[PDB]
Amino acid sequence: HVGTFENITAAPADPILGLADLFRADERPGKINLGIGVYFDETGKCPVLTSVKKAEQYLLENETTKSYLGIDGIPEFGRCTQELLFGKGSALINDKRARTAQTPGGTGALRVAADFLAKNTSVKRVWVSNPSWPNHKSVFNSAGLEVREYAYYDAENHTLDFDALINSLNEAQAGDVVLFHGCCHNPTGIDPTLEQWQTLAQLSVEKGWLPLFDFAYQGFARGLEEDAEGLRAFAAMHKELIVASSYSKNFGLYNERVGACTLVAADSETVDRAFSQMKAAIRANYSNPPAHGASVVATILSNDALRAIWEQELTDMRQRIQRMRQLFVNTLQEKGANRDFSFIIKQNGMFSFSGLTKEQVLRLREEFGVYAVASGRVNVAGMTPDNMAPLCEAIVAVL
Amino acid sequence: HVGTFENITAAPADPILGLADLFRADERPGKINLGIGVYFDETGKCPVLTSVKKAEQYLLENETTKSYLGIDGIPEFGRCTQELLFGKGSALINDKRARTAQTPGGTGALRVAADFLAKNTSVKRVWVSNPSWPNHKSVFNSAGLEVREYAYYDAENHTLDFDALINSLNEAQAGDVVLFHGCCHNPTGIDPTLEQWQTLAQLSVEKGWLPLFDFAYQGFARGLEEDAEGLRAFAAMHKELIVASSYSKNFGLYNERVGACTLVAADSETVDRAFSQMKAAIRANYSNPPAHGASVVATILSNDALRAIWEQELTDMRQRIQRMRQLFVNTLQEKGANRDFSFIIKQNGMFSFSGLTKEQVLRLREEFGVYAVASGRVNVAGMTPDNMAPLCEAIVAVL
Ligand SMILES: *Cc1c(COP(=O)(O)O)cnc(C)c1O
Ligand SMILES: *Cc1c(COP(=O)(O)O)cnc(C)c1O
């Protein structure tokens, strides 16, 4: 017989996760990794947080079973997630308008939302910022949804092009999904102001969009509560929305796959009805979610002494990044860059859109062992005081 | 505007996992849970294995990072899985014809295979046993694949209706997928003999089927190697096959979501090419897999001392279930059943396919607080010396 796999075409490598493979194989001792969005500390390692290690030790000594969780995961994980997103006293919570499923990462939450929408509603299109996280298109296309781009980044001025964004979104119809990053836009690090978020919320209800928030960096811009201001302005006005959140980065729990998909509807009866179909879509995907990482999150957020350790550890990560942004810009000028890079200071989170071309990024890898994403996205949290000078010498050499 | 979620139709509760909510709400003293397929010990609890606690302590002491795994997970986990499935000296391993992705549970492995097949092959139809695990049809339908049933169980003689199985698969075409349970058929506990496996292996190659094995109970029928004889007879003759395996039950790691999807192609170049598309399908779903559970498994299988502990714990579980089967048949007789239940002794695995009707199952629940699946599937591994007599009195009463 002819053979079912014989004619499969090879898939291109992932623009982000393929870099990990390339970086590992490189034998040069000076190689520098500015690709994948993980946090590195001052010594260039990706550590386990102290709050996490303490929680894991608690679990090891007190866990008595690994029996299946429910489809939607650990209840306390869901309650804690809704408080973080919407705030302790939220009317969305008092009115029982929100339901949360624990998922395997924020990616898993994005795919669950996508499958749920494609199979149970009339949604056909998802609007994504230009640029955005490259895996957004893959997730939504895989669920059967069309992806369209709205304008976002002004590459000449290194700023948000708000007029262009609104103009391009006038083409989105009622019942379309519009995706927003909650904070720390990936890859640009340029977020709307509160005033701009409020304008968008007002426009969103007027046009009948279904907001979907990808919230992977709560805490990395200004603070836990501050970073949720944009989402909360939407939640005050909308009958329906979806949040896909991740604890991969703000807890350093990347490989344990800890996220949540939160559904909001006009009332309790409607959200419970919708969530019954979200559960069915989960059952048909991975059945039920992995306990270890979510148990760690729920243990920390439920315990006042552990939470305070964690919040300080998150503030320390945010502030180290801020220090590297400033050090990066100053060192570029000292190494002979005659370009202005001060826009890097105005960007939030791990990632800076550096303005380097694909050919420059390729030279950095091949000639200098400096690994960045082909789009010019650099992970500022990969920078350390020890690698800053060789990094900047390399960038100046390709300008 | 109207609202995206208002036209949604509620989904029913899962026929297996929904039982937990019903059992938890029941206030009748003496209620008995024989529903979801988890192992219980003599005390009615679902314990963590000792080998697993030992491995989790090692991981707590030696993990230095939670940085993302590769898309296909822990390399050693893949190697250990292939040896368990195919045997240490397998030609499939030496010729590098097999690639394995770590997945979230066996369900995740089935879903990844479904998505991969739908988007990269001309497969349109999956054949599943009647009866089967109810989630099989949902997983394959989630990728848009038609699911057909083949005959399997002789409900009169409580045996494999092999002639009907053969005849009912007459219309399965070249390029159709045929799903086989590797051992401990769920729910019937009736498996092909080795001669029957060999007969199916030859028919499958002559007809050009793509075999997909669901392997969730390796080690619960007779033993680790013996339970793989059927798969290995297929692997000796086929150029292509897929194995979705689970460690939920044989390691007691249910809620950590530890499984594997193994692809086999005619040669190394072909399977690598196909595997690159499986990785793309994972990236667009949950991105990369959860580390904790698979690290436990890889640790135990890689250490001769821990592996010997685990193997004994698996033998212990299998033996307790066998003693409970005998006690179940004996006690039904002493409580006055006139129906002959001795066929239950011939069934493999955790379950007894009892022959009770939906009406008798509902009556057990409402009248006696005994919880089984509406198909008549009862979890023998949930029976104990302490609950056996009340259970049997309740069954005898609804007969
Ligand atoms: C990291 C990230 C994700 C994925 O988070 P995971 O928990 O690793 O799946 C999704 N969206 C954005 C914008 C991200 O930065
Ligand atoms: C348990 C089981 C599964 C799913 O296993 P998980 O690892 O819990 O996802 C799939 N198929 C069969 C036949 C099973 O018994």
PDB file of C-alpha atoms and ligand atoms in Angstrom, chain A residues 104-108 110 133 136 181 186 214 216-217 246 248-249 254 257-258 351, chain B residues 68 286-287, ligand 1:
ATOM      1  CA  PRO A 104      -2.039  23.825  30.588  1.00  0.00           C
ATOM      2  CA  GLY A 105      -0.423  27.212  30.192  1.00  0.00           C
ATOM      3  CA  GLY A 106      -1.753  30.344  28.603  1.00  0.00           C
ATOM      4  CA  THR A 107      -1.375  28.672  25.216  1.00  0.00           C
ATOM      5  CA  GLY A 108      -3.716  25.907  26.369  1.00  0.00           C
ATOM      6  CA  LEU A 110      -5.992  30.219  24.097  1.00  0.00           C
ATOM      7  CA  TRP A 133       3.077  36.836  19.337  1.00  0.00           C
ATOM      8  CA  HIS A 136      -1.482  33.529  18.010  1.00  0.00           C
ATOM      9  CA  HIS A 181      -2.590  41.849  25.270  1.00  0.00           C
ATOM     10  CA  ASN A 186       4.598  40.911  22.940  1.00  0.00           C
ATOM     11  CA  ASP A 214      -4.122  37.348  26.409  1.00  0.00           C
ATOM     12  CA  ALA A 216       0.715  36.504  30.151  1.00  0.00           C
ATOM     13  CA  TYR A 217       2.663  39.224  31.993  1.00  0.00           C
ATOM     14  CA  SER A 246      -0.581  32.522  32.166  1.00  0.00           C
ATOM     15  CA  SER A 248       4.447  30.738  33.329  1.00  0.00           C
ATOM     16  CA  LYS A 249       6.395  33.982  33.646  1.00  0.00           C
ATOM     17  CA  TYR A 254       7.084  27.710  32.524  1.00  0.00           C
ATOM     18  CA  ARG A 257       2.027  24.540  32.290  1.00  0.00           C
ATOM     19  CA  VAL A 258      -0.106  26.736  34.562  1.00  0.00           C
ATOM     20  CA  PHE A 351      10.861  42.375  25.188  1.00  0.00           C
TER      21      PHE A 351
ATOM     22  CA  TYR B  68      10.314  25.375  29.125  1.00  0.00           C
ATOM     23  CA  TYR B 286      -0.714  23.595  24.611  1.00  0.00           C
ATOM     24  CA  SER B 287       2.767  24.622  23.347  1.00  0.00           C
TER      25      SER B 287
HETATM   26  C1  LIG C   1       4.239  33.406  27.038  1.00  0.00           C
HETATM   27  C2  LIG C   1       3.053  33.875  26.242  1.00  0.00           C
HETATM   28  C3  LIG C   1       1.988  33.005  26.016  1.00  0.00           C
HETATM   29  C4  LIG C   1       2.037  31.545  26.403  1.00  0.00           C
HETATM   30  O1  LIG C   1       2.144  31.295  27.779  1.00  0.00           O
HETATM   31  P1  LIG C   1       2.381  29.768  28.232  1.00  0.00           P
HETATM   32  O2  LIG C   1       1.870  29.690  29.654  1.00  0.00           O
HETATM   33  O3  LIG C   1       3.855  29.414  28.147  1.00  0.00           O
HETATM   34  O4  LIG C   1       1.590  28.845  27.325  1.00  0.00           O
HETATM   35  C5  LIG C   1       0.871  33.452  25.325  1.00  0.00           C
HETATM   36  N1  LIG C   1       0.771  34.768  24.934  1.00  0.00           N
HETATM   37  C6  LIG C   1       1.817  35.635  25.148  1.00  0.00           C
HETATM   38  C7  LIG C   1       1.692  37.054  24.673  1.00  0.00           C
HETATM   39  C8  LIG C   1       2.973  35.191  25.787  1.00  0.00           C
HETATM   40  O5  LIG C   1       4.005  36.069  25.997  1.00  0.00           O
END
